[PDB]
Amino acid sequence: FLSNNSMVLYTDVSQWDSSQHNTQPFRKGIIMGLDMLANMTNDARVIQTLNLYKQTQINLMDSYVQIPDGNVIKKIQYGAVASGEKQTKAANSIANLALIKTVLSRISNKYSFATKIIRVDGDDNYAVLQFNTEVTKQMVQDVSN
Amino acid sequence: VQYEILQKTIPTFEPKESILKKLEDIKPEQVKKQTKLFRIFEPRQLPVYRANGEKELRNRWYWKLKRDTLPDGDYDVREYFLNLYDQVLTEMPDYLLLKDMAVENKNSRDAGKVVDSETAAICDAIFQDEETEGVVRRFIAEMRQRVQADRNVVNYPSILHPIDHAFNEYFLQHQLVEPLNNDIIFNYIPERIRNDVNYILNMDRNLPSTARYIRPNLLQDRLNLHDNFESLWDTITTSNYILARSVVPDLKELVSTEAQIQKMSQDLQLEALTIQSETQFLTGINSQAANDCFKTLIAAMLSQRTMSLDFVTTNYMSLISGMWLLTVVPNDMFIRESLVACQLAIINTIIYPAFGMQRMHYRNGDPQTPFQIAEQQIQNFQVANWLHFVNNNQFRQVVIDGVLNQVLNDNIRNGHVVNQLMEALMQLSRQQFPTMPVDYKRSIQRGILLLSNRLGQLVDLTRLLAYNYETLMACITMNMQHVQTLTTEKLQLTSVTSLCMLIGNATVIPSPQTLFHYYNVNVNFHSNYNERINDAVAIITAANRLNLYQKKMKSIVEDFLKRLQIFDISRVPDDQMYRLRDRLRLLPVEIRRLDIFNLILMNMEQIERASDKIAQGVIIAYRDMQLERDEMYGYVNIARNLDGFQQINLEELMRTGDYAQITNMLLNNQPVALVGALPFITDSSVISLVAKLDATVFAQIVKLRKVDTLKPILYKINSDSNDFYLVANYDWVPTSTTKVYKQIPQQFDFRASMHMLTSNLTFTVYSDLLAFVSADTVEPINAVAFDNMRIMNEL
Amino acid sequence: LVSTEAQIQKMSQDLQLEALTIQSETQFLTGINSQAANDCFKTLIAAMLS
Amino acid sequence: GVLNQVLNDNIRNGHVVNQLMEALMQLSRQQFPTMPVDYKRSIQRGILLL
Amino acid sequence: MLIGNATVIPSPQTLFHYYNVNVNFHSNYNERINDAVAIITAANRLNLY
């Protein structure tokens, strides 16, 4: 759907690991989802697994980090998300998806477009969109700002 | 060795979190047992002043309020009374035994007992006073507890205000307990379960008539919540579905999967060197899905939750078992587009090519499903009667025992519909495929033979499902509506074939403990539903009969949903709450709440005449009127009739600030009355009386318009006022402008405030009613259905 | 104003606009947000007055 | 001496809108013959929202 | 879809502001019109062509 009437916003998201949107809301959202899912089952083994996974997300919400510097060792408060996990990749894809879905409800205050495609792969993401009319420089600039 | 630290400020997200439960963990209720006797007034010694104002060597007991805490402004007073109504309803008890709270009178002739510690305290105080009459001591000596144990009844003395008597007597005469016998234990159980010889019931107890029990409120949906509150309905539907999954039995010994599937393998004559569509028939013929389908189907059909299909058209056996499914189960029970697509596929690759027809030219939004048009396109007696049945397959909505029921045909229950279908299939097997090759015949006919060699087992399976379905239908309290849901369950037809292919001569029936659990949970939910409805209806009908105009009817509904610990209050909007409110307005109130509110209505003003912090208004007539004699004050600036002068409401002035009238009346000294809740101060002087200060307070109101820095004066005069020699010597009747609109306290009548509260003696109350019942099932082979004929018999 | 997420909930679950295109095509809700309602309220009023 | 673009005075209060919502509820209650079924229930419920 | 139970009306200060502003604009409009007209007519009466 690339055309003279369409545009595409593409964006690198590789620095968004220490960010303020990978802390508390992400984990608590997942915890809430687990609560819903817990109320969506009857078996007990599963609920045990879910409560343990929940508590895992609790522990990942507050997490300190061994780092040497010469001989002595620093340990820093890092209650957020990064790679190095069975969950991190797909979960980061999710989180970037949720983030961009959250961002994307603001161009709608000033433009009419039909979201044709959104894509997220790790350290980047891009969405293409087509308009009711043809594109100009001023609309791209103002949209960008 | 050393460790180093780098601390870090952060934000903190704060959800609402909408605390949930599931049905099995919902606790039923906790009864209100009574605390102290719900007093509103209490006595108090005050001095007393004889007429001419001077003082006795004696005191007197007067009624006063407990907790004078009332606000300024009538709106806030109506708020107070809303809170008061809420408190009494929060304190309204269900049952009460008086002996637990009773105590001993220290002054009874016969050494008898009384009801409360404070009653006897008052008695003792009045006993130890030097200046109290002998008659109240005589009264205290005659007052005792009476008993008639043939009837299990007691009558205890109490001393309390007449309104208090009204409340407590209402509690006595409307305490919801009934005599309990085993006949009521029986008749609380449904008829269908008593009429079922596959469950046997007994108990090892004989309760007495001294026992008691609370009857649940299993009243129906006043609100029609199936009508356009579809989010909650989908939630509820899932919330019953999950409950239903908890109670379907796990299957007993099934036939060996590998052996049955070895037989399938032998009967198919596969080849290791071809693609063979037949191969896909084996997709998902495991155990653990047979059980899954068995649970999912039944829990859906009981919960009235729609369900959707996922199926790959390359697997024809999936379709071939979905045939049976869609035949024996109605079509509106599934979501429309799924089974439309599935039936359409089935037609366009098994059926119309056998009799030599076009595939189809079927529309997406066809107002007819393909089977309806196909009822008339075909030429086949069996299939045509079959399609007629299909078109007229639907539930029967019938109200039995108060609850609605989606009852089957009574030709579906007993599996006979399958004979029409299977006869049609026999007359299809015998067909040639004039258009299509012989390998395709071979594949199709072989697949349908795998299901045609299980005729009896499928009939028995359907009958078994039907039995458990009706048996669980009988254990419902909430009426079961037929309206399509938002959300489905993805059903795999591989699990259906797994179900249909692994069964023989073993029956699963719900254990009675599971039944009783399901029933008690449904009971508790329904009773919670009705009681919270009744609560909320009470508050709404209260608030609309009181002009609580600033109040915003959102938090009430939020509390209503919070007490139902399964809903998402943080993500329900306001419009839905308000529509729920709009329906709630039109409902009748229950008898308890309606009566209590009527009492409170008729007596709130009388209650308001008390509370000696605020007076109900003030007149100003620029004239030196006379003062009235009283005997707890002396001469006071008090009014009690309000005749003459025209009255301005002050809450009306706060609402509609128009100070033109009052201002005009003040410059030109025009007389007026002023109505509205108001403080005062108690000026015990004299020099602030003659100077006529209580008119000085209002001239700021024209300067600064805010009527909040408004504090009237109260001109109290007595023998404890530092200047009472004046009234003795100078011989002047006091006179004052600006009387106050107020009533005096009511003198305390010891005789008439005494009452005798009557109640039962020593009953017991039981809640978990089916704990006394022991229950068991017949042997599963020795079962029997409605038709008086063994299900699960074909071998 | 009303919290957006409630309306998001009910629209999102009852519509299933996720489902109501091709499943392999892109569809979802659109801005219910704040700073658009009052934007509209200003736009409308100022245009009708002018 | 100033011009004004005024309303019908049954609009300044909302009373004429009752007739609108009766019509809209009726439109909800009707089928959409050509239309699909998933898309119809979705549309009907989206109308019933307002 | 997000509104209910919160009334916002113009402050009296806002009303007064918007009235003074509109008054000033209209008054400026009429005064400069009259001035412009006068200067034009005076330029056309002294035969300054």
Spatial distance between the Cα atoms of B6 and B378, rounded to a whole number of angstroms: 81
Identify whether the C-beta of residue B64 lies closer than 8 Å to the C-beta of residue B43.
Answer: yes
A108 in contact with C, Cβ within 8 Å:
yes
Cβ-based neighbours of B316, under 8 Å, separated by 6 or more: B277, B280, B281, B349, B350, B443, B444, B447
Instruction: With CB atoms and an 8 Å threshold, state whether D37 touches B484.
Output: no
Burial zone of A131 (CB within 10 Å; 0-12 exposed, 13-18 middle, 19+ buried): middle
Say how far apart CA B328 and CA B688 lie, in whole Å.
95
- With touching defined as 3 or more inter-chain CB pairs under 8 Å, the answer for chains C and B is yes
Q: Of B228, B230, B337, which is closest to D37 when you measure between CB atoms?
A: B337
- Report the alpha-carbon distance of residue B174 to residue B161 in Å, rounded: 20
Flag whether residue B16 sits within 8 Å of chain C, measured between CB atoms: no
CA B332 to CA B336: how far, in whole Å? 7
CA distance B294 to B287: 11
Structure tokens at B390: 């299909």
Contacts of B487 in chain C (CB under 8 A): 13
For residue B502, give the nearest of B674, B194, B292 by alpha carbon. B292
Contacts of B365 in chain D (CB under 8 A): 32-37, 40
Element (H, E) at B759: strand B754-760
A63: helix, coil or strand? coil
Q: How far is CA B207 from the centre of its chain?
A: 30
Chains A and D lie in contact, requiring 3 or more CB pairs less than 8 Å apart: no
Across B144-230, where does the E strand assignment appear?
146-148, 153-159, 178-179, 199-203, 211-213
Q: Which helix (H) or strand (E) holds B321?
A: helix B316-328
- DSSP conformational letter for B278: G
Closest Cα in chain B to A25:
B13
Is residue E8 within 8 angstroms of chain C, CB to CB? no
Q: Which chain B residues contact residue C10 at CB under 8 A?
A: 231, 573, 576
> Cα separations (Å) of B170 from B84, B175, E35?
17, 8, 87
CB neighbour burial string for B528-544, b if at least 16 within 10 angstroms, e if fewer: bbbbbbbbbbbbbbbbe
Question: Chain B: nearest CA to D40, how far in angstroms?
Answer: 9
- Taking CB atoms and an 8 Å cutoff, what residues of chain D touch C48? 5
CA proximity to B188, closest of B406, B475, B404: B475
| Domain hosting residue B29, numbered range | 1-795
Give the whole-angstrom CA distance, residue B308 versus residue A18: 42
Rounded CA-CA distance B229/B447 in Å is: 45
Contacting residues for B296 by C-beta, under 8 A, at least 6 apart: B245, B307, B489, B491, B495
For strand B403-407 and strand B647-649, is the pairing parallel, antiparallel, or unpaired? unpaired
Assess B575–E contact: CB distance below 8 Å, yes or no: yes
Distance in angstroms (rounded) separating the CA atoms of residues B790 and B774 = 25
Whether residue D41 and residue B484 make contact (CB cut-off 8 A), yes or no, is yes
Please give the sequence-ordered ranges of beta strands (E in DSSP) within B379-516, or none if there are none: 396-400, 403-407, 490-492
CA-CA-CA-CA torsion for B442, B445, B450, B452, nearest 10 degrees? -160
For residue B466, what is the DSSP state?
A: H
H/E stretch holding B126: helix B117-128
How far is B144 from B754, CA to CA, in rounded Å?
Answer: 11
B15 touches C at CB < 8 Å:
no
- B64 in helix, strand or coil? strand
Residues in chain A preceding a C-to-N separation beyond 2.5 angstroms (breaks): none
- Is D45 near chain C, with CB under 8 Å? yes
User: Which of A108, A109, A118 is the closest to C26 by Cβ?
Assistant: A118
Termini Cα distance of chain C: 27
Residue B183 burial (CB count, 10 A): 8
Contact flag B573-C14 (C-beta cutoff 8 Å)? no
Contact B571 C3 (CB under 8 A): yes
Separation of CA B300 from chain center: 25
Inter-chain residue contact C31 with A118, CB threshold 8 Å: no
Helices D38-49 and D17-29, packing angle to 10 deg: 160
**Residue A32, SS3?**
helix
User: C28: distance to nearest CA of chain E, Å?
Assistant: 17
| Short-list B630, B635, B723, CA closest to B60 | B630
Q: Are B144 and B112 in contact (CB under 8 A)?
A: yes
Under DSSP, the state recorded for E26 is H
- Cβ contact A3:A131 at 8 Å: no
Question: Which residue intervals of C1-50 are DSSP H helices?
Answer: 4-15, 37-49
Flag if C14 and D45 touch (Cβ within 8 Å).
yes
- Tell me the C-alpha distance between B542 and B540, whole Å: 5
Q: Which method was used?
A: cryo-EM
Q: How many CB atoms lie within 10 A of CB B572?
A: 21
C29 closest CA partner among C14, C45, C39:
C14
**Tokens 């999950």 sit at which residue?**
B242
The answer to whether B178 touches B215, Cβ cutoff 8 Å, is yes
For chain B, the domain total comes to: 1
Contacts of B364 in chain D (CB under 8 A): 36
Look at residues B762, B567, B759 and name the one whose alpha carbon lies nearest to residue B168.
Answer: B759
- Binding partners of A (≥3 Cβ pairs within 8 A): B, C
- DSSP code of residue B347: I
Report the run of H or E that residue B370 belongs to, with start and end.
helix B370-377
Closest residue in E to C1 (Cα–Cα): E3
Long-range contacts of B200-204, Cβ-Cβ distance < 8 Å, separation of 24 or more? B200/B775, B200/B776, B200/B777, B200/B778, B201/B512, B201/B773, B201/B774, B201/B775, B202/B773, B202/B774, B202/B775, B203/B772, B203/B773, B203/B774, B204/B772, B204/B774
The dihedrals phi and psi of B613, each to the nearest 5 degrees, come to -115, -30
Q: What are the Cα distances from residue B276, in Å, to B353, B440, B441, B452?
A: 20, 10, 13, 21
Resolution to 1 decimal place, in Å: 5.2
Q: How far apart are CA E39 and CA B37, in angstroms?
A: 95
D5, D39, D49 ranked by CB distance to C20: nearest: D39
Residue B334 DSSP label: B
Inter-residue contact B783 to B188 (CB < 8 Å): no
Token pair, residue B632, equals 């707890």
Among candidate residues B101, B95, B114, the one with its CA nearest the CA of residue B171: B95
Q: How far apart are alpha carbons B408 and B419 in whole angstroms?
A: 17
What is the distance between the alpha carbons of residues B602 and B599, in angstroms, rounded to a whole number?
Answer: 5
Query: Considering only alpha carbons, which residue of chain B is nearest residue D31?
Result: B367
Q: CA nearest B701: which of B620, B633, B781?
A: B620
**Alpha-carbon dihedral D50, E1, E3, E4, rounded to 10 degrees:** 30
Please tell me if residue C12 touches chain E, with a CB cutoff of 8 Å: no
d(CA B229, CA B580): 9
